[PDB]
Design a binder for this molecule. Structure first.
Ligand SMILES: Nc1ncnc2c1ncn2[C@@H]1O[C@H](COP(=O)(O)OP(=O)(O)OP(=O)(O)O)[C@@H](O)[C@H]1O
Ligand SMILES: Nc1ncnc2c1ncn2[C@@H]1O[C@H](COP(=O)(O)OP(=O)(O)O)[C@@H](O)[C@H]1O
Ligand SMILES: Nc1ncnc2c1ncn2[C@@H]1O[C@H](COP(=O)(O)OP(=O)(O)O)[C@@H](O)[C@H]1O
Ligand SMILES: [Mg+2]
Ligand SMILES: [Mg+2]
Ligand SMILES: [Mg+2]
Lengths: 187, 491, 442, 470, 105, 128
């Protein structure tokens, strides 16, 4: 049977399960719905009590997914999402579901067309030039794209900035320019 | 990770065809199809692919089935439908197979028409236990002086023909098959031996030459030839010995006597090693799987002599083994030497020294021994064997010259299997001393002339020795008579 | 009891998944829905309620999901005097077609070896009659013997001679364990025991119990059939006070079956190809064969040496587990001398002057020395001795008689008789008589 | 047809993911976006609509996500008489710079072996003009031959002498497949066949087609070029009935290339290190090189022996596929005896008194017997010296050394090495000379009178020259 | 208390994989439930590979494993002279207990 | 570069045994299956794709050349080893240096009986 390949490919068991979920949702047009669904179930699991109930390797799989059936029939969950968690407890891949959730998030954030940019500076950036370079950054992408710009700071790069547009990468740092000048002066 | 954790199964399992009697190919490669589904299939059950190809469910795994393909995988794609047929392998057996050349599944490949047998038999059947058998008593005549004298084989024995490449193993098996023409042409029913030749991993031209050699010796009308050649899939070369063994077990279970030749088992072990390594089973010594002794053992243990309450039939096995550079300390030679009832060891140095058949009597053995010999051959062979052992340990001038005389006596040409009476005549002429006056290079010329003479002149003596089986005192005097006269008249 | 399901069937290894009631290791499980009984011995716990198991007969026709019942105990075989004269396979079913084995007691084949305070020191030599064995490396009651050899040196015929002489001259309920040996030879041994009165099919007075796991069986069966024979002999010692004989033939089949189970049991292989668990598993087996204060089990073990190596892990591991090992060599077997016992490789722990005595010990050492150094008179005496070590009609040569004969050859008292008057004869008397006849004719 | 994307590149192994229309195994795929044509042959189906493929050329410059197009059929090469006089590579493209090969039909390089009912049995000796070959292991018309040898023992010189003699005397569309050999040797063969008129660059009446995948090619090309040449020969045999000669040099490179790609296909290594599918690959390839009832293929194959083993799985497995093996030896070539054929290791299926006659057969068996006796004596000959042998033993050693020397022969293609002119000894001269040396008719000649001669007449002449000059 | 007390996750041929025991030291002697003892040879991220001073038949998946806090040590001293002990210093001669006053790693 | 522009280069690889050892290290660290002497399956390809680039072009491709003198170090004079026989299979001849000749003052210790040059005569001057 044909399968809908997402625009990004994630790998591992997380990648495979999330690719399955995406190609399932794309044939029924329920993608953001199931994102809110897995958001909910991720916050279901992140609380410690039944997190320990489900990561216990001394439960019987029947017991663990019985509690899972219970709590998934509680929150009127979609058959798609209940089925996914049923499969993760069947294959015993349950403890990794956060990752799958993780994967799905990333996947559809390139479905909405977001590009993650990271600007490292030597100084905590000003607001003005922050959004200045935001406007500058905007011009690289096609329309339908949204910058997820997250500028952290590292004061060792000796000035300038290091901007990562996805995997594209401009190193306008001053430390690296100093290294290049030293290399040219030595060679 | 996980064979059945592919994204397709997973996606249309989360979203929501019979998966009990039908499966889908997850991955095909090198003749190993992993199949999702087939939850009801049995281990070693024969399944059917969409393209008409067959397979054997060898690896029942928690989430998939490793099936070995009986053909070329170019006709199997991922996602193909695999059906159950519900049966383990079976082959057609009966008298309708004599003179036919079939493949590892009982299909005719000589274009003489389909097989017209009425009975089928499984190939993975078990061997007869302790009770149905009885001690090996009747002689299987090979028509080879060295074998029938020093390494005698009986009906129900498993004698191994082991040796390096191009030493004469197939020639020994073929002489043995040709030799039964004197018994199958008569009417005494309990001396007839139906032969089965299993060719595993050979050229098709070699098997064609062999079938022509058997037809030109009129030895095909009682022979079956199972042929899993070099181009055939590894499962078929793996399965051919069992098909042949079932075709012979038909004769065994029904009060007839069958002989089967596995030519050879080294290539069967190679095919099984390929299938097992491709099924990801843990390799062992020389990469061979751990259960290859179990393989050859459950194959060879089906050669038995049944007692009179179970019909009185028999099945004799002559497995063939090829050693690499005379190294019997290998894995498959070790196993098959420990399984069988003795080995006919053929050497390469003995082959070019003119000793042909190149049988190494010092290393050969037969655990049945004289119990599988006629009384006459026993009378001559006891003293011959001890003579040769004494000679070899000090290989004193009398010992040396007598041993050289006997060694020249044991040579024999190809495709000329001698009846047992003439063998006894020769060995008598040679052991009681009548060749001490001949220089060894004329012993062959003697043997030839002497036997021309005793077949032309003394048909009554040979006839009575065939009738009784032993050398009667009157017949003893007549043998001394004839050999003295001939040694006088010889030049 | 506990019910599980088959999840995987690979060759001779079956994985079973138990919902509740996980069975400990070494337990026996029964497969439901089969004509003949198919027992699976547990080997590993793999977590998630799954165990790995070795099948006791072929695994064809098994289905993923087939129910499997738990015995709750290791393989239990019937033990008692009602097993004498019968033939049972590795799981205690009769395979002689004479009906069930109606015994009062069942015993598990996996039991602990005797303790240390239960150990015995008494070593009383048992003389067998053979010149080479009883002279150079004689056997001791209560001790393990061992008969090493390649394929074709004469091990089974040697164990047959031993069965004849010893088991007939004994009153202690012998046991024969056929560990992966030819069905033809097993049938011949059965029929030759019957007609020699050792097995009585009518009005049971039989004194040998046979256990047969043969070559066409899976590796698990050939690995546990020696333990089945052990369990029978252990009954006849523990709860009967008898001094039992245990003829194990052949034990290397036990070792190589261990190799074949380890192959797929999911364990990294050791040297040559054997299991990581060879030495200690063969040890847990071989330590149950001992003389406790309750009774004795003297064990005659024929051992298969692959390719006449003697340095192979299985023989080399067995060597330390035996009290009087007599190795059958191929080089002497091709000489026509029989039995093929290697005088310079057969060691006895009772061949010391505190047990056999002055004269016997001196003869043994002198014969071994004159054979090792093999002065033309010395070589002639050495060849005469090589000939006189042979024993064919069968012979019975008592111990004192043979020490006397080998002394008379050693001192040179008969250096005029030809070399091959000592070949295939009994004591010195038959040797001088064969010299008599062969001399006056030729 | 179907289009897919490269998802992994490891050496010569490329994984291609198709979104729809998965290609059957053995199909050819064209990588899109390359200067020269790169073809991938499908080998496995990994699932996930991914396939694993072996590349027929270099994989450098390949990017994950590159487009790949499905051809719908296996590698198809042009077959016909228009292939004669041309050089083509593993995928049928001309590599001789003479334009396209305009044939009317193309054949897939993967085919089924001829059935059992098509096998032919006829066995007629093929005389090569070489002494040791025609005497101790005669070749057969329409039989697979095979020439085993280590590194630098005379495999290619012997195969070129056989080319010269047989192929030149022949009339049946020879074919030469260079598999994993020196490109220099391929150029040499091309030009010595151009000058000898066997390849006609104009007015095409050529009678040999060349196919070359040499040492410089990636493992996929070296693993399929044998099949390409095999396919050309199969066409000439079946669809024309011609009597084809097929020379393959070297055919161990096919097994070796399979072994090089086997690791990357994710398969557990067999013994030594080869692929688990060594024997069945060799069988599917070697069972198509055969004589049928439709035509005749005389197949000479050079077989490299790694580290002079002969028990290495590749030579050991090749042995069973041949009708007349000729085993060269390094220990013999270090004595200066060429061709270095081992007399006691070369066999034949027509070495039968009912085929070669009792004269030939008995002479061959006697030669081998005397050489075997010499070999068995050699140990104490070199320990104690010959001065301790029996007089009969000294005679057997003398005749054995003479037979050793007489087995050597100067080769027409080896004048550059031997200095002598190449001799072509016909069969009866061989039989008679060896019969005479056996009978004892030359117990007086020096042994060096037999080294590198033609018939025995030249041996007596050389002895006379040695006796008069020295 | 999953820091001084683990639970057996798997067992086979002498090797107990134990989940838990987050504070056990490498080569520390732990005590199974059935009285047997073991040594923590492998300290892996998810489990502890313990080697059992006994047999596999008696321990079973799910058993409890306590920890002693000390590396493997034996009794030493004069009191051992004349006594036959096993590899842990326990008397196997039936002459009673060893009156040893000093232990030593 | 010289071979392609109508000039003549010579190249010495000193030695190729150490390159095979380095490639064996890389292959074993990549978990690839080791063959004879633990060498990978494609050590022959390793040396043969290299020594195949030493060619002699014709006058339509410039007429240049590139001569290669690969060096191989044997153990105890064993020439029937794996890598020596690989490179002997690749090259056009050998120059066998012997330890017996080298120790006996014969330097250069070339074994004339075993040294060969498959091309040889075609590239000598007439006087030589
Ligand atoms: N008794 C004999 N006398 C003379 N020649 C013989 C004899 N036996 C065999 N030969 C010849 O020796 C050669 C090898 O014979 P054969 O093929 O039957 O042995 P093999 O073990 O099957 O070798 P292979 O490895 O090819 O299978 C043949 O040419 C055969 O004709
Ligand atoms: N009395 C005897 N006469 C002749 N041969 C004998 C005698 N006893 C034993 N043999 C020979 O001993 C050999 C070894 O037989 P067997 O006991 O099966 O060997 P093993 O047990 O060592 O494998 C056989 O070839 C058998 O014929
Ligand atoms: N018939 C021969 N006469 C003289 N020398 C030969 C003969 N055959 C081979 N040689 C020598 O052995 C060397 C190796 O030859 P060749 O067959 O090309 O090696 P390979 O074994 O790799 O095919 C040649 O260079 C040549 O010097
Ligand atoms: Mg053969
Ligand atoms: Mg035996
Ligand atoms: Mg070559």
């Amino acid at each position: 049977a044909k399968l809908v390949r997402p625009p990004v490919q994630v790998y591992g068991i997380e990648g495979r399960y999330a690719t399955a979920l995406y190609s399932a949702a794309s044939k029924q047009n329920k993608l953001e719905q199931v994102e809110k669904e897995l958001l909910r179930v991720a916050q279901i699991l992140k609380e410690p009590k039944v997190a320990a109930s489900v990561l216990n390797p001394y439960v019987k799989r029947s017991i663990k997914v019985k509690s899972l059936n219970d709590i998934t029939a509680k929150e009127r969950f979609s058959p798609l999402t209940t089925n996914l968690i049923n499969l993760l407890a069947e294959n015993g891949r349950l403890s990794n579901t956060q990752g799958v959730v993780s994967a799905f998030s990333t996947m559809m954030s390139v479905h909405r067309g977001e590009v993650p940019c990271t600007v490292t500076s030597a100084s905590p950036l000003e607001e003005a030039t922050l959004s200045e370079l935001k406007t500058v950054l905007k011009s690289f992408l096609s329309q339908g794209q949204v910058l997820k710009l997250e500028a952290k700071t590292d004061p060792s790069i000796l000035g300038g900035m290091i901007v990562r547009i996805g995997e594209k990468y401009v190193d306008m740092s001053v430390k690296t320019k100093i290294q290049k000048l030293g290399r040219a002066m030595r060679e | 990770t996980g064979t059945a954790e592919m994204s397709s199964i997973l996606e249309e399992r989360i979203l929501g065809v019979d998966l009990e009697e039908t499966g889908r190919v997850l991955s095909i490669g090198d003749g190993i199809a992993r199949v999702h589904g087939l939850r009801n299939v049995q281990a070693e059950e024969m399944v059917e692919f969409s393209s008409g190809l067959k397979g054997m469910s060898l690896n029942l795994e928690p989430d998939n089935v490793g099936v070995v393909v009986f053909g070329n995988d170019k006709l199997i794609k991922e996602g193909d439908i695999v059906k159950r047929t519900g049966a383990i392998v079976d082959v057609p057996v009966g008298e309708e197979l004599l003179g036919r050349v079939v493949d590892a599944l009982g299909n005719a490949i000589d274009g003489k028409g389909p097989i017209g047998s009425k009975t089928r038999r499984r190939v993975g059947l078990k061997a007869p236990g302790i009770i149905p058998r009885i001690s090996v008593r009747e002689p299987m005549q090979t028509g080879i002086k060295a074998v029938d004298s020093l390494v005698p084989i009986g009906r129900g024995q498993r004698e191994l023909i082991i040796g390096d490449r191009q030493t004469g193993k197939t020639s020994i098996a073929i002489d043995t098959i040709i030799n039964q023409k004197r018994f199958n042409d008569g009417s005494d029913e309990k001396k007839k031996l139906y032969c089965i030749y299993v060719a595993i991993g050979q050229k098709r031209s070699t098997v064609a030459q062999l079938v022509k050699r058997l037809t030109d010796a009129d030895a095909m009308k009682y022979t079956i030839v199972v042929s899993a050649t070099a181009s055939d899939a590894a499962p078929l070369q793996y399965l051919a010995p069992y098909s042949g063994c079932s075709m012979g077990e038909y004769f065994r279970d029904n009060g007839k006597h069958a002989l089967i030749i596995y030519d050879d088992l080294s290539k069967q072990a190679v095919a099984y090693r390929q299938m097992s390594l491709l099924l990801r089973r843990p390799p062992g010594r020389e990469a061979y799987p751990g259960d290859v002794f179990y393989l050859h053992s459950r194959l060879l243990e089906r050669a038995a002599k049944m007692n009179d309450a179970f019909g009185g039939g028999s099945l004799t096995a002559l497995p063939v083994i090829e050693t690499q550079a005379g190294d019997v300390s290998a894995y498959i030679p070790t196993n098959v030497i420990s399984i069988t009832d003795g080995q006919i060891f053929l050497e390469t140095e003995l082959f070019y020294k003119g000793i042909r058949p190149a049988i190494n009597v010092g290393l050969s053995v037969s655990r049945v021994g004289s119990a599988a010999q006629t009384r006459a051959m026993k009378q001559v062979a006891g003293t011959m064997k001890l003579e040769l052992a004494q000679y070899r340990e000090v290989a004193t001038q009398q010992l040396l010259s007598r041993g050289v005389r006997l060694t020249e006596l044991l040579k024999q040409g190809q495709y000329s299997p001698m009846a047992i009476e003439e063998q006894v005549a020769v060995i008598y002429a040679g052991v009681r001393g009548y060749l001490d006056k001949l220089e060894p290079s004329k012993i062959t010329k003697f043997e030839n002339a002497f036997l021309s003479h005793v077949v032309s002149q003394h048909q009554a003596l040979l006839g009575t020795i065939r009738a009784d089986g032993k050398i009667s005192e009157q017949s003893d005097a007549k043998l001394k008579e004839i050999v003295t006269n001939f040694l006088a008249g010889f030049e | 009891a506990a019910t599980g399901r088959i999840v995987a069937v690979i060759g001779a290894v079956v994985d079973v998944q138990f919902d509740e009631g996980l069975p400990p290791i070494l337990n026996a499980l029964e497969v439901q829905g089969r004509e003949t009984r198919l027992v699976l011995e547990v080997a590993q716990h793999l977590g998630e309620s799954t165990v790995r198991t070795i099948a006791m007969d072929g695994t064809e026709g098994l289905v993923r999901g087939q129910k499997v019942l738990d015995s709750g105990a290791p393989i239990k075989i019937p033990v008692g005097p009602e097993t004498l004269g019968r033939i049972m396979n590795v799981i205690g079913e009769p395979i002689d077609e004479r009906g069930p084995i109606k015994t009062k007691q069942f015993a598990p084949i996996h039991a602990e070896a005797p303790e240390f305070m239960e150990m015995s020191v008494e070593q009383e030599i048992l003389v067998t009659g053979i010149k080479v064995v009883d002279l150079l490396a004689p056997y001791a009651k209560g001790g393990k013997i061992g008969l090493f050899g390649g394929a074709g040196v004469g091990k089974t015929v040697l164990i047959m001679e031993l069965i004849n002489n010893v088991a007939k001259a004994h009153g202690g309920y012998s046991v024969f364990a056929g560990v992966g040996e030819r069905t033809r030879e097993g049938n011949d041994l059965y029929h030759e025991m019957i007609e020699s009165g050792v097995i009585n099919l009518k009005d049971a007075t039989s004194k040998v119990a046979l256990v047969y796991g043969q070559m066409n069986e899976p590796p698990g069966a050939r690995a546990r059939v020696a333990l089945t024979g052990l369990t029978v002999a252990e009954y006849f010692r523990d709860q009967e006070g008898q001094d039992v004989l245990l003829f194990i033939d052949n034990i290397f089949r036990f070792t190589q079956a261990g190799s074949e189970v380890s192959a797929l049991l999911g364990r990294i292989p050791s040297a040559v190809g054997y299991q990581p668990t060879l030495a200690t598993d063969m040890g847990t087996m071989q330590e149950r064969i001992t003389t406790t204060k309750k009774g004795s089990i003297t064990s005659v073990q024929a051992i298969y040496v692959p390719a006449d190596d003697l340095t192979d892990p299985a023989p080399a591991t067995t060597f330390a587990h035996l009290d009087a090992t007599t190795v059958l060599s191929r080089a002497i077997a091709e000489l026509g001398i029989y039995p093929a016992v290697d005088p310079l490789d057969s060691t006895s722990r009772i061949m010391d002057p505190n047990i056999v005595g002055s004269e016997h010990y001196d003869v043994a050492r002198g014969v071994q020395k004159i054979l090792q150094d093999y002065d033309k008179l010395t070589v002639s005496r050495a060849r005469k001795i090589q000939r006189f070590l042979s024993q064919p009609m069968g012979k019975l040569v008592p111990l004192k008689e043979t020490i006397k004969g080998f002394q008379q050859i050693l001192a040179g008292e008969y250096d005029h008789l030809p070399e091959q008057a000592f070949y295939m004869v009994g004591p010195i008397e038959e040797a001088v008589a064969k010299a008599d006849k062969l001399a006056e004719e030729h």
